[PDB]
């Protein structure tokens, strides 16, 4: 009924410690408290039973060791290794592989986490409002140019479309048939997406018959068009993306931010 | 079980017959607890739609699901800890929010069933039949009862009628729908609704979705449509062996008004709604939720606003209490129609011997 | 902020209301026995205007007469009414230019375009505007917005678009598209210049239109400078914003209250329906602003005026209105309709979301399923119309008629179908 | 169209067994169509139907 997956990879995005021969992405003590410790704590809070961590080509035993020693654990944590890995997909290829072991619902959570917010309320939201998928966006760094933008809805709370600024046409575009049903659409500037995914019961059919998603974003939330043509088959409750806003200063990892995180922690 | 008590709000000097508060937000849940029940509790905590009849059905469904999930263990027998589990569940339900007579009856029936089937029988064979029997029971003591009610209404109700109702009496709604679409007759249906619950509004919406002409009403006046109103059905929850009714909100007021002006009121119910317990006032057993339904300034339910309201303890002594279930009278609801077709509420327990 | 002067636009878009307008104009026609400019006048009075500018052009004489009749020509009020002359079927640029040439205003002036019915307080808004002005020199105009009627599924013609701000409240862009009949465009481009100066952005699509602007002493100068502008919403404000004058900003304010401008027929119908319901509180028929009308609220959702004669055995519905001196024999199955003052009726009116204007003589029998009857357009015997049917001026309807959806009836006693004199689509006589 | 008897003759005998599909109850018993011997209605009175909630 309740199981979770922990994504782990290799330090490709980070620039100035990560390129060492024996040090992994999961075990990085950059800012006092360990990186995967937080994740473990979160898991514990969430009351999830059989949680399995997915491992890449690099580091096979180190993660196991981390899981076992150092720390209270008690619960049966197991480290499984899929084979089809390229990194040219971060975890999509792993997700595709692990699907018959999912009995009910699963949550996607990376190895790197910075958390301060209450985390039960996300789960509760996912449960209650008849939501298929729910993601999170958090405020810009408060402590003392070209930016990234995403779609929001605030009074029900809903998500629509996702585009960054790396590879796109210079001017913005809004579809017509994806407006006559669900009218009001809002775009915010300050918000930063943490890349946390929640999945319901019927999602396993997509990642075995016809995959298209890259970096776990393309063919997951954006194909919710119930107008115009009707060509791509919808899987049944209609396809609906969701988003929520939170106050506390803690966010994602994609660019150079470790140094800022370090500055932040001592408060 | 987990964690109990630790909650705000005073005991209240006026009206304290039953305990007032609970488990809403989940933390450190036990391994053996089925999540469906938890989900149901979460729903009920802030529910709009269900009332009396569908709740019981939902409970039954949940029980069936649980049964389906469970198999006879190696060490412990089939009748070893099942009863204990049931008791625990009941306790949890009580903790969440007080329950109905129908639910109790269902529980009793379940217990009887458990008593009936001997543990020496083949296990697979047992629940195969047990589940079927449960299904049959569900069909009979609910859907068939509803059908019977409908048929009673059919013979009695005149050639096209103006109908007035209150609450979320699902059976009555169904009947109305049938009248509108299946048998096809004129339906000038009037629905009344209060502040704390938006049940009436929901009913109206549903009717609109089916294509029905509805008249929406509130507390401030009722008589404005009366002084014209010809035939009325009341909101139902539970019946007593007095001849009285334990129902929702200002239904009693409506009944009184009806008594005063022209014509009495009538209520149709299920044959397994009746109790053998008795009471005669709105002080006996009060059904309570948190005083928060009128804190938000009207309109919709989830809003979150900045204003003035929110003084439960902030200012120099203030209490904002309410009631959900009240006492409906006897001399006015002359009609009672069940699985036994015809009779009066003056015959308060004529069917209790027959069952 | 004492002593004010404003310019109001009336008879803005004729031919948009295609069935009507030939001798009697557009704005002169009532909503439900009461004209639409009256509300505007009331609003102006509430505001505190001392000098009123008003434009007349098409069928102007009658409008002028009506204005004269209404009790504002006398010096009891702080304001006087003056007429601005303009050629047949005109825009707003030319008129603005004319006004500029004439040259009177010193300080603040308000331009209201279209047909606006309001139930809102504006003193606070004015105060806010003043405050904004005090804040910084380079500041232009104020605008109003409101949340739309739930879901736009029946309202098909106009879907608005606004890109606003939280702190200072500012917008540049606006867009409209059709779609439900035949789809076309699926892309809209947005300004990428300077954004991070204010940081916060709130985009809202479906909102109720009115077109109101509280303007400072900049607009006429701007007009004088650049003579290429035609309309204010599409060209002017946007132009001003787009690197024309450095540092110039606008202000915005939101109100949830009912305020709708009229443009089409279905919209008009919806407005009428809203009025029939108790949606408006400063504007209801029982209060009576004119002090000559005697309408009062009644049971089973009906509006009525004194003395209405009707024969025995009746059947009445909801959200209706019946005028004074409406002499009815047998019949009436009234469901969701407006009927004007004094209507002689022979027998029976099957009413299913219908409409009737000022002074209509109806003969024998009519099965009506959502249709409108205009002023002095008398109905003969046997009237049968489907949904959305609209009749014009002086239509002397005789024996036997059948029409369907989207059909339009003329007013001329010029080009359009369904003729006035001697029947409609059963005989050809007239111009 | 669905008709025709299952056996050789139209009308049943004495002591023979038949299966019935019920349509409506109360007032008489069950004047109902047969699935063993023709589609024409056959009736039971409210006495031979039950032995040991019956109307439910």
> What distance in Å separates residue B269's CA from the closest CA in chain D?
15
Q: In chain B, what residues touch A124 (CB-CB under 8 Å)?
A: 25-26
CB contact under 8 A, A124 and B303: no
CB-CB under 8 Å, A127 with B25: no
Residues 6+ apart with CB under 8 A from B153: B175, B268, B337
Q: Name residues whose C-beta falls within 8 Å of residue D10's C-beta, 6 or more positions apart in sequence.
A: D38, D40
C2 to chain A, any CB pair closer than 8 A? The answer is no
Contact A1 B27 (CB under 8 A): no
Residue B350 CB-half CA count within 13 A: 14
Q: Provide the residue range defining the domain that includes B67.
A: 11-148
Question: Is the CB of A227 inside 8 Å of chain C's CB atoms?
Answer: no
Any CB–CB contact under 8 A between A228 and chain C? yes
Exposure of B40 by Cβ count < 10 A (0-12 exposed, 13-18 middle, 19+ buried)?
Answer: buried
Q: Is the Cβ–Cβ distance between C176 and C286 less than 8 Å?
A: no
Strands (E), chain A: 2-7, 52-54, 78-80, 105-110, 133-138, 150-152, 186-188, 192-193, 197-199, 241-246
The method of structure determination was cryo-EM
Q: Do B28 and A128 touch (CB under 8 A)?
A: no
Domain edge (last residue) among B128, B148, B168? B148
Relative orientation angle of helices B101-116 and B53-69, to the nearest 10 degrees: 30
Q: Are residues B143 and B153 in the same domain?
A: no
Q: Using the beta-carbon criterion (under 8 Å), do A127 and B39 form an inter-chain contact?
A: yes
Q: Is D24 on the interface with B (CB under 8 A)?
A: no
Partner-chain contact A175 C200, CB within 8 Å: no
Rg of chain C in Å (alpha carbons): 24
Contacts of B225 in chain C (CB under 8 A): 299-300
User: What's the structural domain count of chain B?
Assistant: 2
Whether D56 sits inside 8 A of B355 (CB atoms) is: no
Within a domain: B1: no
**Minimal CA–CA distance to C81: which of C63, C102, C96?**
C63
Q: Which residues of A touch C199 (CB under 8 A)?
A: 189-190
Report, in this order, helix, strand and coil percent for chain D, each rounded to 5. 0, 20, 80
Per the domain annotation, does B274 fall within a domain? Answer: yes
Pair (B137, B168) in one structural domain: no
Contacts of A172 in chain C (CB under 8 A): 188-190, 192
Q: How far is A185 from chain C (nearest CA, A)?
A: 6
Measured CB to CB, residues of chain A less than 8 Å from chain B are: 1, 47, 120, 124, 127-128, 155
* Beta strand pairing call for B333-337 and B265-268: parallel
Most B CBs within 10 A among C256, C278, C299, C336, hence the mutation to make, goes to C299
Q: Beta strand A133-138 with A241-246: parallel, antiparallel or unpaired? A: parallel
CA angle B188, B201, B285 (to 5 degrees): 110
d(CA A139, CA A206): 33
Q: Shortest CA distance to C299 belongs to which of B304, B223, A90?
A: B223
Contact partners of B by the rule of 3+ C-beta pairs under 8 A?
A, C, D
With CA atoms as reference, the chain B residue closest to C335 would be B213
For residue B3, is it within any domain? no
Among the partner-chain residues C185, C190, C200, the one whose CB lies closest to the CB of A176 is C185
How many Å is the maximal CA-CA distance in chain D? 39
Same-domain pairing of B60 and B191: no
Same domain as B130, residue B254? no
Q: Nearest residue of C to residue A170 by CA position?
A: C192
In sequence order, what are the beta bridge partners of B247?
B326
In a domain, residue B2? The reply is: no
**Cβ distance of A120 and B25 shorter than 8 Å:** yes
B242 located within any domain: yes
Residues whose CB is less than 8 angstroms from the CB of residue A61 and which lie 6 or more positions away in sequence, other chains included: none
> B43 to chain A: nearest residue by CA?
A128
Q: Which residue of C has its CA nearest to A182?
A: C151
Chains sharing 3 or more CB pairs under 8 A with chain A: B, C
D22, D23, D53, D54: which to substitute to probe chain B, counting the most B Cβ within 10 Å? D53
Structure tokens at B225: 């449509």
Q: What is the DSSP letter of A206?
A: H
**H helix runs in C70-148, sequence order:** 93-102, 123-135
Of B96, B119, B148, which closes a domain? Answer: B148
Would you call C100 helix, strand, or coil by DSSP?
helix
* Distance between C195 CA and the closest CA of chain A, angstroms: 9
CB A149 within 8 A of CB A193: no
Q: Do A1 and B42 touch (CB under 8 A)?
A: no
Distance from CA of B28 to the nearest CA of A (A): 7
C and A in touch (3+ CB pairs within 8 angstroms) = yes
Give how far Cα A9 sits from Cα of A60, A135, B36, B52, Å.
11, 21, 36, 53
Residue B31 lies in a domain: yes
B132 and B269 belong to one structural domain: no
Do B154 and B221 reside in the same domain of the chain? yes
Pairing between β-strand C109-112 and β-strand C139-145 as defined by DSSP bridges: unpaired
Closest CA to C51 of C82, C79, C16, C87: C79
Report chain B's terminal Cα–Cα distance, integer Å: 36
What 3-state class would DSSP assign to C94? helix
* Euclidean distance between CA atoms B24 and B290, whole angstroms: 12
At C199, is the secondary structure helix, strand, or coil?
coil
Structure tokens at C409: 């009836």
> Are the CB atoms for C114 and C174 separated by under 8 Å?
no
The answer to whether D55 faces chain B, any CB pair under 8 Å, is yes
Q: How many CB pairs under 8 A join A and C?
A: 56
Q: Check: CB of residue A1 under 8 Å from CB of residue A103.
A: yes
Q: How far apart are CA C340 and CA C90, in angstroms?
A: 32
Dist. CA C311–CA C331, nearest whole Å: 8
| Interchain proximity A155–B25, CB inside 8 Å | no
- Tokens 């249709």 correspond to C371
Q: Are C190 and A172 in contact (CB under 8 A)?
A: yes
Looking up tokens 């900003």, which residue turns up? C249
Residues 6+ apart with CB under 8 A from B169: B51, B52, B53, B233, B235, B236
- The whole-angstrom distance between A189's CA and the closest CA on chain C is 7
Beta bridge partners of A5: A52, A108
CA C182, C184, C186, C191 torsion-angle sign: negative
Looking at chain C, which residue has its C-alpha nearest residue B223?
C299
Sign of CA dihedral C236, C242, C245, C249: positive
Q: Which residue from C253, C256, C250 is spatially nearest to C236, judged by alpha carbons?
A: C250
Distance CA A75, CA A140 (A): 36
- B182 and B108 inside one domain: no
Q: Which residue from A147, A172, A179 is facing C190, i.e. has the nearest CB?
A: A172
Same domain, B164 and B273: yes
Contacting residues for C391 by C-beta, under 8 A, at least 6 apart: C19, C371, C372, C373, C374, C377, C397, C409, C418
Cβ of C204 within 8 Å of Cβ of A188? The answer is: no
Chains B and D touch (3+ CB pairs under 8 A): yes
| Residue (of C335, C254, B341) closest to D53 by Cα position | B341
Element (H, E) at C58: none
Q: What is the CA radius of gyration of chain A?
A: 19
Tell whether C199 lies on the interface with A, counting CB pairs under 8 A: yes
Q: Which helix (H) or strand (E) holds C52?
A: strand C49-56
Nearest 5 degrees, angle CA C55-CA C59-CA C62? 85
Backbone angles phi, psi at C372, to 5 degrees: -115, 135
- By C-alpha distance, the chain A residue nearest B29 is A47
Dihedral, CA of residue B123, residue B127, residue B128 and residue B129, to nearest 10: 110
Residue C12: in which H helix or E strand, if any?
A: none
CA-based nearest residue in chain A for residue B304: A155
Q: Could you tell me if B216 and B324 lie in one domain? A: yes
**Are the Cβ atoms of A186 and C202 closer than 8 angstroms?**
yes
Q: Looking at chain C, which subunits does it touch, using at least 3 CB pairs closer than 8 Å as the criterion?
A: A, B
Between the two ends of chain C, the Cα-to-Cα distance in Å is 54
- Are A and D close enough to touch, i.e. 3+ CB pairs under 8 angstroms? no
Q: Residue C185 corresponds to which tokens in the numbers above? A: 């465009």
Q: Give the 3-state secondary structure of chain B.
A: CCCCCCCCCCCCCCCCCCCCCCCCCCCCCCCCCCHHHHHHHHHHHCCCCCCCHHHHHHHHHHHHHHHHHCCCCCCCCCCCCHHHHHHHHHHHHHHHCCCCHHHHHHHHHHHHHHHHCCCCCCHHHHHHHHHHHHHHHHHHHHHHHHHHHHHHHHHHCCCCEEEEEECCCHHHHHHHHHHHHCCCCCEEEEEECCCCCCHHHHHHHHHHHHCCCEEEECCCCCHHHHCCCCEEECCCCEECCCCCEEEECCHHHHHHHHHHCCCCEEEECCCCCECCCCCCCCCCCCCCCCCCCCCCCCCCCCCCCCCCCCCCCCCCCCCCCCCCEEEECCCCEEEEECCCCCCECCCCCCCCCCC
Judged by CB atoms closer than 8 Å, whether chains meet at D53 and B140 is answered as: yes
Chains touching chain D through at least 3 C-beta pairs below 8 angstroms are B
B327 bridge partner residues: B246
Q: Could you tell me if residue B273 is inside a domain? A: yes
For residue B6, tell me if it sits in a domain. Answer: no
What's the gap in Å between the CA of A234 and the closest CA on chain C? 22
CA distance D54 to C101: 96
Q: What are the residues of chain B with a beta carbon less than 8 Å away from any beta carbon of chain D?
A: 140-141, 144, 271, 339-340, 355
- What is the spatial distance between Cα A95 and Cα A92, in angstroms, rounded to a whole number? 5
- Cα C104 from chain centre: 28
Question: What is the C-alpha end-to-end distance of chain A, expressed in Å?
Answer: 39
Residue B221: which residues within 8 A CB-CB, separation 6 or more?
A: none
Phi, psi of C298 (to 5 degrees): -135, 175
Q: Which residue among B117, B148, B179 closes a domain?
A: B148
Q: Which two tokens stand for residue A169?
A: 């046409």
Is A168 touching C (CB cutoff 8 A)?
no
Q: Are B155 and B250 within one domain?
A: yes
Candidates A178, A153, A173; CA nearest to A163 is: A173
Give residue numbers after which chain C breaks (C–N above 2.5 Å).
Answer: 413
| Same-domain check for residues B50 and B174 | no
**Chain C: closest CA distance from residue A178 (Å):** 9
| D56 and B CB contact within 8 Å | yes
Distance from CA of B26 to the nearest CA of A (A): 8
Residues B36 and B71 in one domain: yes
Interatomic CA distance for residues A85 and A55, integer angstroms: 10
Q: B139-161 b/e with 16+ CB inside 10 Å = b?
A: eebbebbbebbbebbeeebeeee
Residue C123's contacts (CB-CB under 8 Å, 6 or more residues apart) are: none
The reported resolution of this PDB entry, expressed in Å, is 4.6
Q: Are A128 and B27 in contact (CB < 8 Å)?
A: no
């Amino acid at each position: 009924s309740i199981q979770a997956f922990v994504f782990c990879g290799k330090g490709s995005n980070l620039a100035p410690m990560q390129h060492s021969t024996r040090l992994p992405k999961a075990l990085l003590p950059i800012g006092n408290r360990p990186m995967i410790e937080y994740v473990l704590d979160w898991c514990d809070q969430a009351d999830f039973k059989e949680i399995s961590v997915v491992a890449p080509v690099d580091e096979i035993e180190l993660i196991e060791s981390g899981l076992t020693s150092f720390l209270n654990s008690n619960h049966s944590h197991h480290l499984q290794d899929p084979k089809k890995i390229n990194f040219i997909s971060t975890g999509e290829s792993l997700q595709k592989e692990l699907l018959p072991r999912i009995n009910g619902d699963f949550v996607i959570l990376p190895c790197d986490f910075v958390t301060d917010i209450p985390p039960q309320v996300l789960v509760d939201q996912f449960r209650n409002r008849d939501d298929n998928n729910l993601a999170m966006t958090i405020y810009y760094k408060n402590s003392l140019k070209q930016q990234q933008f995403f779609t929001v809805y605030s009074e029900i709370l809903l998500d629509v479309y996702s585009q960054r600024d790396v590879t796109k046409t210079k001017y913005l575009q809004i579809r017509s048939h994806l407006l006559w049903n669900y009218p009001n659409l809002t775009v915010s500037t300050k918000l930063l997406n943490s890349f946390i995914y929640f999945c319901s019961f019927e999602l396993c059919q997509l990642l075995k018959l016809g995959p298209q998603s890259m970096s776990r974003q393309a063919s997951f939330k954006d194909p919710f068009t119930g107008n115009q043509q009707q060509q791509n088959p919808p899987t049944t409750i209609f396809i609906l993306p969701n988003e929520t806003l939170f106050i506390r200063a803690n966010n994602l990892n994609a660019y150079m931010d470790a140094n800022r995180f370090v500055l932040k922690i001592k408060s | 079980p987990g964690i109990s008590s630790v909650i705000p709000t005073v005991l209240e000097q006026s009206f304290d017959n039953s305990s007032l508060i609970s488990v809403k937000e989940l933390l450190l849940n036990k391994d053996l607890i089925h999540p469906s029940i938890l989900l149901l509790t979460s729903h009920l905590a802030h529910y709009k739609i269900v009332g009396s009849i569908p709740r019981c059905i939902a409970m039954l469904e949940v029980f069936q699901i649980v049964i389906k999930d469970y198999q006879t263990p190696k060490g412990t027998t089939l009748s070893r800890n099942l009863t204990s589990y049931l008791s625990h569940q009941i306790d949890l339900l009580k903790k969440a929010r007080p329950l109905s007579v129908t639910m109790g009856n269902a529980i009793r029936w379940l217990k009887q069933e458990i008593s009936l089937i001997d543990p020496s029988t083949p296990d697979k064979a047992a629940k195969k039949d047990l589940c079927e029997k449960i299904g049959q029971f569900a069909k009979e003591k609910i859907e068939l009862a509803d059908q019977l009610i409908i048929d009673n209404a059919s013979t009695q109700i005149e050639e096209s009628t103006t109908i007035v109702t209150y609450g979320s009496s699902k059976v009555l709604t169904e009947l109305l729908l049938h009248n509108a679409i299946s048998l096809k007759k004129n339906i000038k249906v009037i629905v009344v609704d209060s502040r704390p619950l938006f049940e009436g509004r929901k009913m109206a919406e549903t009717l609109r979705n089916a294509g029905v002409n509805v008249m929406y009403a509130l507390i401030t006046s009722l008589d404005t449509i009366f002084n014209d109103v010809d035939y009325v059905f009341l909101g139902a929850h539970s019946i007593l062996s007095n001849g009285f009714l334990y129902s929702r909100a200002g239904t009693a007021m409506l009944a009184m008004s009806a008594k005063r002006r022209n014509i009495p009121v009538l209520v149709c119910c299920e044959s397994l709604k009746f109790s053998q317990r008795v009471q005669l006032d709105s002080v006996t057993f009060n059904e309570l939720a948190d005083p928060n339904d009128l804190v938000n300034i009207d309109y919709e339910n989830p809003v979150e606003r900045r204003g003035n309201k929110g003084a439960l303890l902030n200012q120099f002594i203030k209490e904002r209490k309410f009631e959900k279930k009240k006492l409906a009278m006897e001399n006015k609801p002359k009609g009672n129609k069940i699985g036994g077709k015809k009779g009066s509420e003056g015959e308060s327990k004529d069917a209790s011997n027959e069952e | 902020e004492d002593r004010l002067q404003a310019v109001v636009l009336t008879d803005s878009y004729e031919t948009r209301f295609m069935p009507l307008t030939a001798v009697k104009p557009r704005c002169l026609l009532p909503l439900a026995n009461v004209p639409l400019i009256e509300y505007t006048l009331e609003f102006l009075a509430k505001a505190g205007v001392h000098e009123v500018f008003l434009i007349c052009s098409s069928h102007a004489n009658q409008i002028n007469d009506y204005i004269e009749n209404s009790k504002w020509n006398l010096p009891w009020s702080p304001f006087k009414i003056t007429t601005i002359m303009s050629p047949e079927a005109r825009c707003t640029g030319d008129v603005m230019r004319d006004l500029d040439n004439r040259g009177i205003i010193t300080g603040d002036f308000i331009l209201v375009s279209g047909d606006v019915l309001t139930n809102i307080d504006f003193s606070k808004m004015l105060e806010f505007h003043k405050k904004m002005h005090l804040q910084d020199k380079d500041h232009i105009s104020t605008m109003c917005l409101s949340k739309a009627s739930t879901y736009p599924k029946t309202r098909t013609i106009e879907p608005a678009a606004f890109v606003l701000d939280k702190s200072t409240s500012r917008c540049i862009y606006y867009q409209d598209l059709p779609l439900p009949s035949s789809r076309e465009k699926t892309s809209i481009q947005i300004d990428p210049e300077l954004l991070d100066n204010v940081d916060e952005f709130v985009i809202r699509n479906d909102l109720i239109d009115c077109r109101i602007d509280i303007c400072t002493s900049h607009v006429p100068l701007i007009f004088q400078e650049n003579f290429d502008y035609q309309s204010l919403r599409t060209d002017f404000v946007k132009g001003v914003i787009s690197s024309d004058i450095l540092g110039k900003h606008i202000y915005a304010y939101l109100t949830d209250e009912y305020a709708v401008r009229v443009e089409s027929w279905q919209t008009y119908d919806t407005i009428s329906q809203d009025f029939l319901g108790r949606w408006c509180y400063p504007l209801v028929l029982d209060s009576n602003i004119q002090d000559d009308q005697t309408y009062s609220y009644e049971s089973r959702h009906i509006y009525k005026e004194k003395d209405v004669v009707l024969a025995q055995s009746c059947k009445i519905g909801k959200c209706t209105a019946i005028g004074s001196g409406t002499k009815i024999g047998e019949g009436t199955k009234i469901e969701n309709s407006v009927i004007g003052r004094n209507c002689q009726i022979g027998e029976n009116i099957r009413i299913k979301n219908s409409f009737i204007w000022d002074d209509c003589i109806i003969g024998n029998n009519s099965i009506i399923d959502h249709s409108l009857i205009a002023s002095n357009a008398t109905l003969g015997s046997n009237v049968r119309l489907n949904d959305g049917c609209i009749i014009g001026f002086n239509v002397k309807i005789d024996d036997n008629m059948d029409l369907d959806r989207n059909t339009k009836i003329s007013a001329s006693p010029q080009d359009l179908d369904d003729q006035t004199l001697a029947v409609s689509i059963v005989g050809d006589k007239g111009v | 169209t669905s008709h025709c008897r299952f056996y050789e003759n139209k009308y049943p005998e004495i002591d023979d067994i038949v299966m019935v599909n019920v349509q409506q109850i109360a007032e008489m018993g069950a004047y109902v169509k047969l699935l063993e011997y023709d589609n024409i209605e056959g009736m039971i009175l409210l006495s031979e139907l039950s032995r040991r909630s019956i109307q439910k």
